Design an enzyme around this catalytic site. Structure first.
Site, PDB file in Angstrom:
ATOM      1  N   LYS A   1       0.713   5.822  -1.355  1.00 15.66           N
ATOM      2  CA  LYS A   1      -0.067   7.066  -1.238  1.00 15.66           C
ATOM      3  C   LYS A   1      -0.568   7.205  -2.741  1.00 15.66           C
ATOM      4  CE  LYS A   1       0.356  11.024   1.393  1.00 15.66           C
ATOM      5  NZ  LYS A   1       1.313  11.164   2.430  1.00 15.66           N
ATOM      6  N   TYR A   2       0.050   6.374  -3.807  1.00 19.86           N
ATOM      7  CA  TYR A   2      -0.530   6.443  -5.283  1.00 19.86           C
ATOM      8  C   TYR A   2      -1.323   5.190  -5.349  1.00 19.86           C
ATOM      9  CZ  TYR A   2       2.870  10.258  -6.654  1.00 19.86           C
ATOM     10  OH  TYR A   2       3.760  11.326  -6.620  1.00 19.86           O
ATOM     11  N   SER A   3      -0.897   4.134  -4.834  1.00 13.75           N
ATOM     12  CA  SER A   3      -1.786   2.968  -5.263  1.00 13.75           C
ATOM     13  C   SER A   3      -1.550   1.756  -4.252  1.00 13.75           C
ATOM     14  CB  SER A   3      -0.944   2.322  -6.558  1.00 13.75           C
ATOM     15  OG  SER A   3       0.435   2.147  -6.537  1.00 13.75           O
ATOM     16  N   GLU A   4      -2.243   0.521  -4.565  1.00 12.37           N
ATOM     17  CA  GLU A   4      -1.979  -0.553  -3.857  1.00 12.37           C
ATOM     18  C   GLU A   4      -1.696  -1.702  -4.921  1.00 12.37           C
ATOM     19  OE1 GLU A   4      -6.328  -0.176  -1.838  1.00 12.37           O
ATOM     20  OE2 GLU A   4      -4.695  -0.998  -0.442  1.00 12.37           O
ATOM     21  N   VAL A   5      -0.655  -2.696  -4.367  1.00  9.02           N
ATOM     22  CA  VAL A   5      -0.359  -3.557  -5.565  1.00  9.02           C
ATOM     23  C   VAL A   5      -0.824  -5.245  -4.916  1.00  9.02           C
ATOM     24  CG1 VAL A   5       1.608  -4.594  -6.666  1.00  9.02           C
ATOM     25  CG2 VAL A   5       1.466  -2.235  -6.258  1.00  9.02           C
TER      26      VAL A   5
ATOM     27  N   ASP B   1      11.462   8.125 -10.150  1.00  5.17           N
ATOM     28  CA  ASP B   1      11.356   7.525  -9.099  1.00  5.17           C
ATOM     29  C   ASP B   1      12.394   6.459  -8.805  1.00  5.17           C
ATOM     30  OD1 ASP B   1      10.090   7.422  -6.418  1.00  5.17           O
ATOM     31  OD2 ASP B   1       8.509   6.287  -7.337  1.00  5.17           O
TER      32      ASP B   1
ATOM     33  N   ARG C   1       0.860  -1.183   0.014  1.00  2.32           N
ATOM     34  CA  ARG C   1       0.095  -0.136  -0.129  1.00  2.32           C
ATOM     35  C   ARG C   1       0.870   1.407  -0.013  1.00  2.32           C
ATOM     36  NH1 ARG C   1      -5.661   0.971   1.385  1.00  2.32           N
ATOM     37  NH2 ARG C   1      -5.789   3.082   2.398  1.00  2.32           N
TER      38      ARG C   1
END
Ligand SMILES: NCc1cc(Cl)cc(-c2cccc3[nH]ccc23)c1
Length: 324
Positions: free
Chosen positions: A47-51, A151, A45
């Site tokens: 700030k931008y997404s969940e994998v 990044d 988890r």
């Protein structure tokens, strides 16, 4: 105002392109079928997404699913365009599908499975050189295609150590390099932010990824996680200045006619440039060589224009020992 800057390599790749290549907002998304997949477990988890780990229930193939939070969802056309333009490239993650959940009304990117930051503080001297060369193949590839990753950090490098395979992932902050364009400085993760980002210099390029790569290299060879341990973005620059020195820092902001935020007056001070041998001790001396230190020195430079490009980095004597 600030002195303008251009990349010294791949400067005009996007200007020669048909608008479809870089004009990501014009791109029309061909949504796949979300029912083709079953989510198995959450892998992380952010700030931008969940994998998530998932299975394509049609063919029984394992996949990786990245579900985008609103900030990332709004820029999905850019990330898709970049992933499709780079698909098949050396050590680049393969985008397999683009789906939308009618339940949550959120989009997701589906990627071909990759096996796996706990590893990079455990590598031998040879494996640091080997894995650094593999990362360089991916950075030269995307830079040559007019893309900045923005990044680069250990969490965005997936290593399959048993099969000596590596993938550069999370192209969520990646952007097309356009000469003269002013970019958002709120990119990369704190410890890997290039000085240009910290001094609010917006006309940056591919060389930003080369600073990030040097931070990763310094952390691996010196066994210091992270190498530049800033408490915040201001303290991040102070940590860098305690190593690279304040004299070269001021020459950098002077060359580009940049003014530091006045809050640097009560925290920056004056620091001599330290020699890289200063970070060598009994626990890490087997990972350090004159070639390693010369290479690191040529990546971690304030002036983004003076850093080795990915290609020049691949020519470095540090990689002579790596089987090619
Ligand atoms: N068939 C179930 C399934 C498969 C996949 Cl690949 C994804 C999802 C999902 C779940 C929750 C939020 C989401 N946003 C975008 C997709 C998505 C559901």
């Amino acid at each position: 105002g600030p002195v303008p800057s251009r990349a010294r390599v791949y400067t005009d790749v996007n200007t020669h392109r048909p608008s479809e290549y870089w004009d990501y907002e014009s791109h029309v998304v061909e949504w796949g079928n979300q029912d083709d997949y079953q989510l198995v477990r959450k892998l992380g988890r952010g700030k931008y997404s969940e994998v998530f780990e998932a299975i394509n229930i049609t063919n029984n193939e394992k996949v990786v699913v990245k579900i985008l939070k609103p900030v990332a969802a709004a820029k999905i056309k850019r990330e898709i365009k970049i992933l499709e333009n780079l698909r098949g490239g050396p050590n680049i993650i393969t985008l397999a599908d683009i789906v939308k959940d009618p339940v949550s009304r959120t989009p997701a990117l589906v990627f071909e499975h990759v096996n796996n930051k706990q590893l990079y503080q455990t590598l031998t001297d040879y494996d640091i050189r080997f894995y650094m060369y593999e990362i360089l193949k991916a950075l030269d590839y995307c830079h040559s295609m007019g893309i900045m990753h923005r990044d680069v950090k250990p969490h965005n490098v997936m290593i399959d150590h048993e099969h000596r395979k590596l993938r550069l992932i999370d192209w969520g902050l990646a952007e097309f390099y356009h000469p003269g364009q002013e970019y958002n400085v709120r990119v990369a993760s704190r410890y890997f932010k290039g000085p240009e980002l910290l001094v609010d210099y917006q006309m940056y390029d591919y060389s930003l990824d080369m600073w990030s790569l040097g931070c990763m290299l310094a952390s691996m060879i010196f066994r210091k996680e992270p190498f530049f341990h800033g408490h915040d973005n201001y303290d991040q620059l102070v940590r860098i200045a305690k190593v690279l020195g304040t004299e070269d820092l001021y020459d950098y902001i002077d060359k580009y006619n940049i003014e530091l935020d006045p809050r640097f007056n009560d925290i920056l001070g004056r620091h001599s440039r330290k020699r890289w041998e200063r970070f060598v001790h009994s626990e890490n001396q087997h990972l350090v060589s004159p070639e390693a230190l010369d290479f690191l020195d040529k990546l971690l430079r304030y002036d983004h224009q003076s850093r080795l490009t990915a290609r020049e980095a691949m020519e470095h004597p540090y990689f002579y020992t790596v089987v090619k």
